[PDB]
Design a protein around this ligand. Structure first.
Ligand code: CLA
Ligand code: CLA
Ligand code: CLA
Ligand code: CLA
Ligand code: CLA
Ligand code: CLA
Ligand code: CLA
Ligand code: CLA
Ligand SMILES: CCCCCCCCCCCCCCCC(=O)OC[C@H](COP(=O)(O)OC[C@@H](O)CO)OC(=O)CCCCCCCCCCCCCCC
Ligand SMILES: CC1=C(C/C=C(\C)CCC[C@H](C)CCC[C@H](C)CCCC(C)C)C(=O)c2ccccc2C1=O
Ligand code: SF4
Ligand code: SF4
Lengths: 154, 73, 27, 80, 83, 741, 61, 38, 31, 119
């Protein structure tokens, strides 16, 4: 059963064990060593690390699990970086497709791919920002796809 | 059938060994009864024990009963 | 667990061996 | 033997015969191309089958297609 | 090709006599390179099963005498190259 | 004669041809219609005897390229001196070296990886050095951070002189070929000028820097009371206290009373019992011996003054009867073909690097080097590995000579091709020696494997069982015990303490123990002779069958990196002189993997470890070699199962980056097999079946996406098999010995 | 038909099958494969320059 | 003059873009480390 | 339980059967 | 060996004593006037024909195939002219009517002793 992670026992056992275990090296230095300040910053980055995983679900393992159902209580877990990611490589993919359908109609398409025309490249890098309703409106013209390309025997 | 007497305890034996390469020290690393047989890791005594073979005699009549069938095929 | 049943078995698979070599030199 | 067959795509550019280091291939005057030539493979008893012809066959797809057939002494290329 | 299989013993003259009288004392042999060997083979020659790895002047003056003796007989066949 | 004719303003220096990739090859300036142009661009980036046959233009290109290599090496050493300066704990390491583990690289604090900063002491953390730079700096006498900064900045200065030198010697002053075929002068300046003045000037550094400094650090002086090497030459008085022969000046040198220089120079050998290194009196005396001996050596090549040899009149004079012509032609081979010179120099360079490894483990020449065992391990191992690869470079570039630059007119009946007349009798007897040593080097391991597995340990090859005591190695090692009284008359100790007397300990750490060789060490030496003979088989089969085999009698007409001939002759895959080098790299991995698996486990059983009270002994595995190296279950269990345990439990600690470079190197090793086993007849229409999925969405790439070629599609399987395979033993070894030593 | 015309192929072992290409030379001397067609892209032989018959001569407009 | 063509090639712009997005990941993981939400 | 039969049958199938089977098969290359 | 395998003896003439390379290996003496040369297999021999012909003129050359019965053969050339050059004596064998695209499917050839292209 996925307990809420802020109250799970083995979670806070890992809190005591890692703050104490990393803290064992912190007594190897004086009060004004640069390493001692670095492990001050590291202990801060462990208490923040465990307070910022409060609303997750760590089960009996004491390790924060995830949920990928789109439950809308786990939306910040999976689906918000899911839609975020699909926007980012939809950006990248529409940039690359748009640049290849640029260099397909140029003088010499071979030299276009070694030496990227950074004018027209950085045109398409930035212009491919709104690929759902630009790739979709280039799909409604019947132009994202193709037909009767290369194939083997049958 | 010694395994049928004690199914949890006794480790089930496969066929026996005749190595002329076992000098002495390996011969004491296999003694499960008088034979030095391999422990049978194939679940066959469990299937023959749910079948209800509780004997070695029924296994001989079965072994003859499949030499007959192999000769038939 | 007995003795003569083993001999009955090796006779029956000797016959089965002759039927195997009888299948061998015809196909 | 390794059966060499030379189809009607053979436009007679003769990189095949120059590419064969066995002289299984020769050129035959054949009035069906612009050069008037079409290659022939009469002596396939010496044909290794190394497909060095098919590398240097600049047709559409392989006018000369080597099919790997029999394996004699000469067609296996063993020295002894 | 070996047209001159003439002499071998000229190396035995040529390698023992150049290595007998120079003693050069504080090494294994206080005597020369060969005198420390001929004395240290006659103790072992009469079918002695001994001579272990700690037998110094048998093994060491075995190899160091054979390695110059081989070299001087080979150079003796090089002594039939100027013909 | 000797004269230097130099073309000026050879090549203009605009960035125009950088915009033309593949400008250099007219076979490759067509531009990429396929993606194989991308990889052929890099496979022809240094085929200098494939750009143009004109050896002048080639020779300018290579000779300018060497300065680029030395520029990268001076950037590398300037990097090591700066990471020694700003980032290392070397100043604190100089106080107590046996307690402080050496660290330079201080990992930047991003997510997690700040835990790699190992608290190695010195008050400052960071990942631990295994390269052994601090031992060479204590030997060289670098006291504080200032010489590391300044020597780093001089490293960048020489890097600028090598970039400017290479630009200067390709573009605006580049020589003729008559400069290059003036090779008696080249040997005449490299024997004498490079190595002679190198060892002589280094004897200057050791006598006027290291002998006072590593006398004071041997006396245990803190690195603040130590004066600068500066201050030992303003007056002889600070050195006459340390070495009282400096008071006499150079006067006993010029009168040849060299008995007086017993303070500065001696012949003692052994090791320093205090620092665990060689005596720098012996090392400075040694570099004087290389000094005078190489300056003698340089002057045997007639250049202008009619005094000295020429190589032609040497090689003609050995007109032996069983070779017929003698060495006629080799001065014309080695001064017209670069690849043959690269074969010789990579063979001797690689075998020198192996010699470096074997001379560094047993005579540890740096102070406190044998104390920290990871620097003792990885400087054996690293120089063993480059010392391996360079021999395969000999086996390749010998074949690149034999395919390209062979000409039978200059090379007719001499010592060279008379081998190739009976190369069947060469390779056939290598075949026999490989089978005989494989049976008698590994069949003994299957024997002891079975006899230990069959219970009958009375039939093994142990010391208790049928023994195979190495007779010859124990005998000559016993001679090396008896050296410094008998034959090395003016010595005191032996050539090493791998030979003779009782062990040398520094800080309760065993610096060197006399290595015992009994009946297991024997069989591993026959492993090494075996897998050396197999690489010699593949790398002589790669050269004698390079140009014209009896399978394929025109390979020079096909080239060097051709994949094959075809399915004819029943299949002629992998038959080129390059493909034997493809095989010799796997056998390089085998041969050196069991060299270092002999090293790092015999010396974790027979040498290294600690010493306790009353001089009592303790090894790391605890004498667990001769009862365990005889089998393979003892080898795999007791070595690869047991020594892995400090690499595998290394998580949550500073050794966990080796726990990442262990698994990832298993990944790269396993990832090579995809390239080795399959071939482009699969991947080309797998890829083209993906090209359908780009042609459907108009994402057809204009450079056509081929698969790799065959030779690239096996060269990359080598270069992953070796990167993953070598980095496994890398992470395993450094995570093993850092975790204890 | 003519030189310079942009021609789709209908032969399944053409590498450029169902891809248009430009006509370079046509011979009218009963050569069985007279219409030499080269292409933008490149087969595995490295060679765009091939030739075809008249049944595999389908142009576009 | 033609250096900017060399700074428009495939590997150089590959390093000047993967170096840049690499710096986006590292500079976005120094400022907000341990980011499993959102 | 005839405890002597593997002492006969294990060697005569283990070694001497791949002698006569080498003869029957290997001469049966030419028969 | 020579008592059971077809030795290939290559006979040719030259003008000057040059030096070529054997297919067995190494440099050969190359008798200037006329010289025969026993070999092992045909690719060695025509590889030597490429070895000499692409360098310089070695014409009036052909291997007499010593088959072990005792007599010879003659292949390169037969009509006296070089094979990629076109002579009006050679009869072409080894063709079909079209490309591979009209070759028969091997399920139409299954259980018959035919080829995948004869039709
Ligand atoms: C122009 C950019 C671009 C675009 C839009 C696509 C799109 C596609 N590829 Mg892909 N691909 C690309 C480049 C691209 N590819 C490159 C450069 C390679 C070589 C590494 C591949 C190798 C590849 C394989 C092997 C496969 C696909 C497949 C696919 C399809 C499924 C999506 C997927 O998993 O992608 C796969 C994505 C990758 C393998 C990694 C992405 C490739 C690079 C890193 C990103 C591309 C950005 C591009 C370089 C930007 C250049 C332009 C810009 C400078 C102006 C999809 C149509 C699959 C398919 O057929 O599915 C139907 C498939 O099996 N691709
Ligand atoms: C005694 C003079 C001398 C010295 C010291 C060297 C030293 C070297 N030569 Mg060299 N060489 C010389 C004479 C000399 N050469 C002559 C006379 C010829 C012509 C026959 C050549 C032909 C030659 C070739 C063809 C090659 C070398 C290479 C090398 C380098 C090997 C790499 C190495 O050891 O790095 C250790 C590095 C050092 C020890 C640094 C050395 C720098 C010091 C300052 C000496 C350099 C002085 C310089 C040569 C004087 C030029 C005069 C000019 C300024 C007016 C090394 C720097 C190889 C190389 O890498 O190319 C550069 C190479 O391929 N040499
Ligand atoms: C008297 C001068 C002298 C001194 C003090 C040293 C001292 C040293 N050398 Mg040495 N060396 C010398 C001369 C000298 N060498 C000469 C002249 C050569 C070239 C032949 C070498 C070649 C050499 C190698 C290859 C190695 C050393 C190494 C070492 C170190 C190991 C410690 C030891 O016990 O070695 C004592 C040294 C010796 C027993 C060498 C004696 C060499 C004699 C002087 C050669 C005489 C030359 C002459 C032509 C005779 C040659 C044939 C002869 C054998 C019959 C030590 C610092 C090892 C090292 O690097 O340490 C890690 C190592 O691997 N040396
Ligand atoms: C572990 C796998 C393995 C093994 C055992 C071998 C073994 C061998 N390789 Mg090798 N090889 C391997 C992997 C392996 N290779 C891989 C992965 C590559 C990839 C690059 C190569 C590439 C390679 C090349 C390129 C060459 C070899 C060659 C050889 C042979 C060297 C001669 C020798 O040692 O004979 C001794 C044999 C052994 C040690 C094998 C064990 C034999 C035991 C000891 C005795 C017999 C067992 C048993 C009694 C048999 C009877 C019972 C049975 C009949 C029922 C040897 C058989 C060379 C060759 O052709 O031979 C010279 C050669 O040129 N190998
Ligand atoms: C190749 C390495 C090797 C070697 C050297 C041995 C050696 C041995 N094994 Mg063995 N073994 C090996 C591999 C090897 N094994 C492997 C790989 C396996 C597993 C497959 C086994 C499995 C095995 C078992 C199961 C047993 C042994 C046993 C033995 C011992 C007796 C065998 C015997 O009678 O020899 C027979 C020897 C010969 C017939 C001699 C032939 C070779 C001669 C010397 C060649 C001489 C040629 C000559 C030099 C030509 C030059 C001179 C001429 C020109 C005049 C013997 C020590 C037995 C034992 O009890 O150990 C004590 C035993 O029970 N082995
Ligand atoms: C063949 C093996 C061998 C080797 C490697 C050496 C090596 C050496 N001997 Mg030596 N020596 C040998 C046999 C050998 N010796 C024998 C057989 C004798 C007896 C004739 C001597 C008598 C001898 C003397 C008398 C001296 C050397 C010295 C030396 C050292 C200086 C280099 C040199 O000889 O000049 C060098 C380590 C010299 C030395 O100890 O200086 C370090 C020295 O004075 N040797
Ligand atoms: C090309 C990638 C890249 C990008 C986008 C940034 C972006 C940024 N860096 Mg930066 N940085 C980079 C590479 C990059 N850096 C590299 C390679 C280094 C090492 C030399 C640094 C070293 C660095 C420092 C030392 C600092 C920044 C800082 C900053 C921020 C100031 C605005 C900004 C987010 C500043 C900041 O806000 O950090 C606190 C700052 O102080 N950067
Ligand atoms: C492909 C599989 C995969 C996936 C889905 C993830 C996913 C994740 N990894 Mg990751 N990782 C992977 C493979 C993967 N990793 C591999 C193979 C390695 C070994 C090299 C790592 C090593 C690694 C480390 C060392 C760390 C992560 C972390 C993370 C988390 C945050 C990433 C980050 O930097 O966000 C922050 C970045 C952004 C917010 C930038 C996006 C902003 C966009 C570009 C702006 C424009 C949008 C409009 C995230 C859950 C981090 C973590 O805390 O784990 C939970 C972390 O510290 N990973
Ligand atoms: C080394 C001893 C070899 C004796 C050969 C003596 C020798 O080389 O004499 C030199 C002789 C060449 O005779 P020539 O008088 O012509 O030599 C002068 C000329 O070579 C110089 O132009 O070479 C041979 O006869 C080749 C025989 C190789 C036969 C195989 C030998 C290699 C097997 C031994 C491998 C062992 C290596 C480990 C060494 C322990
Ligand atoms: C997988 C495989 C391939 C396919 C390998 C493909 C073709 C290469 C994949 C890696 C390249 C580098 C991808 C190209 C991507 C570019 C780097 C652009 C990406 C954008 C940035 C990363 C720069 C072979 O070609 C092959 C050939 C012969 C034997 C075995 C194999 C084989 O196993
Ligand atoms: S087929 Fe290709 S190679 Fe053979 S001749 Fe016609 S064109 Fe030249
Ligand atoms: S098959 Fe081998 S030999 Fe016969 S032609 Fe094609 S390539 Fe030349």
């Amino acid at each position: 059963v996925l307990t809420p992670c802020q109250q799970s026992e083995a979670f806070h056992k890992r809190e005591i064990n890692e703050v104490r275990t990393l803290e064992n090296r912190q007594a190897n230095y004086e009060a004004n060593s640069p390493s001692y300040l670095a492990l001050q910053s590291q202990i801060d980055q462990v208490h923040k690390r465990f307070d910022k995983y409060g609303t997750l679900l760590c089960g009996q393992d004491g390790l924060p699990h995830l949920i990928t159902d789109g439950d809308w209580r786990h939306a910040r877990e999976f689906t918000i970086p899911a839609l975020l990611f699909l926007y980012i490589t939809g950006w990248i993919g529409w940039v690359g497709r748009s640049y290849l359908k640029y260099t397909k109609e140029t003088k010499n398409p071979t030299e276009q791919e070694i030496i990227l025309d950074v004018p027209m490249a950085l045109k398409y890098m930035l212009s491919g920002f709104l690929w759902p309703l630009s790739a979709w409106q280039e799909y409604r013209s019947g132009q994202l796809l193709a037909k009767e390309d290369e194939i083997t025997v049958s | 059938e010694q395994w049928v007497a004690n199914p949890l305890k006794t480790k089930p034996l496969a066929h026996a060994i005749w190595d002329p390469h076992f000098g002495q020290a390996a011969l004491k690393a296999f003694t499960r009864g008088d034979t030095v047989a391999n422990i049978s890791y194939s679940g066959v005594y469990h299937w023959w024990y749910t079948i209800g073979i509780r004997n070695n005699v029924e296994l001989y009549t079965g072994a003859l009963g499949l030499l007959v069938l192999s000769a038939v095929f | 667990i007995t003795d003569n049943q083993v001999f009955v078995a090796l006779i029956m698979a000797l016959v089965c061996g002759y039927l195997a070599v009888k299948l061998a030199k015809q196909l | 033997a390794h059966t060499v067959k030379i189809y009607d795509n053979c436009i007679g550019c003769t990189q095949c015969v120059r590419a064969c280091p066995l002289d299984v291939l020769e050129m035959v005057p054949w009035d069906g191309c612009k050069a008037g030539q079409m290659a022939s493979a009469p002596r396939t008893e010496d044909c290794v089958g190394c497909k060095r012809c098919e590398t240097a066959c600049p047709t559409d797809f392989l006018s000369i297609r080597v099919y790997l057939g029999g394996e004699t002494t000469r067609s296996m290329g063993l020295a002894y | 090709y070996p047209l001159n299989p003439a002499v071998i013993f000229i190396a035995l003259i040529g390698w023992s006599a150049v290595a007998a009288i120079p003693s050069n004392i504080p090494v294994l042999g206080g005597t020369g390179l060969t005198q420390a060997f001929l004395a240290s083979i006659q103790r072992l020659l009469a079918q002695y099963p001994t001579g272990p790895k700690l037998d110094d002047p048998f093994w060491f003056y075995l190899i160091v005498y054979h390695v110059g003796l081989f070299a001087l007989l080979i150079f003796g066949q090089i002594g039939y190259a100027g013909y | 004669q000797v004269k230097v004719v130099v073309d000026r303003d050879v090549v203009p220096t605009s960035f125009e041809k950088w915009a033309k990739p593949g400008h250099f090859s007219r076979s490759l300036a067509k531009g990429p219609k396929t993606t194989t142009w991308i990889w052929n661009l890099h496979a022809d980036a240094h085929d200098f005897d494939s750009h143009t046959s004109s050896l002048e233009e080639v020779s300018r290109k290579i000779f300018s390229a060497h300065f680029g290599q030395l520029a990268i090496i001076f950037i590398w050493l300037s990097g090591m001196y700066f990471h020694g300066a700003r980032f290392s704990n070397y100043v604190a390491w100089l106080s107590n070296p046996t307690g402080i583990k050496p660290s330079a690289q201080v990992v930047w604090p991003i997510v997690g990886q700040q835990i790699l900063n190992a608290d190695v002491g010195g008050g400052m953390q960071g990942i631990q050095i295994t390269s052994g730079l601090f031992q060479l700096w204590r030997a060289s006498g670098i006291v504080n951070e200032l010489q590391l900064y300044v020597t780093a900045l001089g490293g960048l200065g020489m890097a600028g002189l090598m970039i400017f030198a290479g630009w200067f010697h390709y573009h605006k002053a580049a020589p003729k070929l008559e400069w290059f075929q003036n090779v008696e002068s080249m040997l005449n300046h490299h024997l004498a000028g490079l190595l002679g003045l190198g060892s002589l000037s280094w004897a200057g550094h050791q006598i006027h820097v290291s002998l006072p400094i590593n006398k004071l650090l041997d006396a245990g002086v803190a690195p603040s009371s130590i004066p600068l090497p500066h201050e030992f030459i303003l007056n002889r008085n600070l050195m006459a206290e340390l070495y009282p022969s400096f008071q006499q000046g150079l006067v006993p040198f010029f009168t040849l009373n060299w008995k007086q220089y017993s303070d500065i120079l001696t012949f003692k050998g052994g090791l320093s019992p205090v620092t665990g290194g060689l005596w720098l009196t012996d090392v400075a005396h040694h570099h004087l011996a290389i000094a005078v001996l190489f300056l003698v050596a340089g002057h045997m090549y007639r250049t202008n003054w009619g005094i000295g040899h020429s190589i032609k009149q040497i090689l003609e004079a050995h007109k032996g009867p069983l070779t017929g012509e003698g060495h006629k032609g080799l001065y014309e081979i080695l001064t017209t073909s670069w690849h043959a010179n690269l074969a010789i120099n990579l063979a001797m360079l690689g075998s020198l690097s192996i010699i470096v490894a074997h001379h560094m483990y047993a005579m540890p020449p740096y102070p406190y080097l044998a104390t920290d065992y990871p620097t003792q391990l990885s400087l054996f191992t690293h120089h063993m590995w480059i010392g391996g690869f360079c021999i395969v470079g000999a086996g390749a570039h010998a074949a690149i000579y034999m395919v390209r630059d062979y000409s039978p007119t200059v090379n007719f009946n001499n010592v060279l091709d008379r081998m190739i007349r009976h190369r069947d009798a060469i390779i056939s007897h290598l075949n026999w020696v490989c089978i005989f040593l494989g049976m008698h080097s590994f069949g003994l391991y299957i024997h002891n494997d079975t006899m230990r597995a069959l219970g009958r340990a009375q039939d093994m090859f142990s010391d208790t069982a049928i023994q195979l005591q190495p007779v010859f190695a124990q005998w000559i090692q016993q001679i090396h015990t008896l050296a410094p009284g008998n034959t090395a008359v003016n010595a005191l100790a032996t050539a090493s303490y791998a030979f003779g007397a009782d062990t040398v300990t520094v800080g309760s750490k065993i610096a060197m123990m006399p290595i015992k060789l009994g009946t297991a060490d024997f069989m591993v030496h026959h492993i090494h002779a075996f897998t050396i003979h197999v690489t010699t088989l593949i790398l002589l089969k790669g050269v004698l069958y390079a140009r014209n085999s009896r399978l394929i009698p025109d390979k020079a007409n096909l080239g060097f990196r051709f994949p094959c001939d075809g399915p004819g002759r029943g299949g002629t895959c992998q038959v080129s002189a390059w493909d034997h080098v493809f095989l010799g790299l796997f056998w390089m991995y085998n041969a050196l993997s069991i060299v270092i698996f002999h090293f790092s486990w015999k010396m974790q059983s027979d040498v290294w470890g600690t010493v306790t009270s009353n001089g009592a002994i303790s090894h790391i595995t605890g004498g667990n070699f001769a009862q365990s190296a005889i089998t393979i279950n003892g080898w795999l269990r007791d070595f690869l199962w047991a020594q892995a345990s400090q690499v595998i439990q290394s998580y949550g600690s500073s050794l966990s980056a080796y726990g990442l470079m262990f698994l990832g190197a298993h990944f790269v090793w396993a990832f090579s097999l995809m390239f080795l086993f399959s071939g482009r007849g699969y991947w080309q229409e797998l890829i083209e079946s993906i090209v359908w999925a780009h042609n459907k969405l108009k994402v057809a790439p204009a450079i056509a996406p081929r698969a790799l070629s065959i030779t690239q599609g096996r060269a990359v399987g080598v270069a992953h098999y070796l990167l993953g395979g070598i980095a496994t033993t890398w992470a395993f070894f450094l995570a093993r010995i850092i975790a204890v030593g | 038909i003519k030189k310079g015309s942009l021609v789709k192929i209908l032969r399944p072992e053409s590498f450029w099958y169902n891809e248009v290409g430009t006509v370079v030379n046509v011979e009218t001397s009963k050569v069985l494969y007279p219409v030499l067609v080269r292409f933008d892209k490149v087969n595995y032989s490295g060679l765009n320059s091939t030739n075809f018959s008249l049944d595999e001569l389908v142009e576009i407009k | 003059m033609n250096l900017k063509k060399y700074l428009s090639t495939a590997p150089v712009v590959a390093t000047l873009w993967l170096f840049l997005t690499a710096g986006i990941l590292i500079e976005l993981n120094r400022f907000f480390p341990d980011s499993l939400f959102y | 339980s005839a405890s002597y039969l593997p002492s006969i049958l294990v060697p005569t199938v283990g070694l001497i059967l791949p002698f006569a089977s080498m003869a029957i098969l290997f001469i049966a290359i030419e028969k | 060996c020579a008592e059971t395998e077809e030795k290939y003896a290559m006979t040719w003439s030259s003008d000057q004593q040059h030096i070529f390379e054997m297919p067995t290996g190494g440099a050969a003496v190359m008798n200037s006037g006329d010289n025969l040369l026993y070999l092992a297999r045909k690719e060695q021999a025509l590889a030597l024909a490429t070895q000499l012909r692409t360098q310089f003129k070695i014409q009036d050359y052909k291997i007499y195939r010593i088959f072990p019965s005792g007599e010879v053969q003659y292949l390169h050339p037969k009509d006296g002219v070089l094979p990629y050059q076109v002579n009006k004596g050679r009869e072409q064998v080894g063709r079909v009517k079209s490309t591979i695209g009209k070759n028969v499917n091997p399920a139409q050839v299954k259980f018959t002793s035919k080829a995948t292209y004869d039709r």
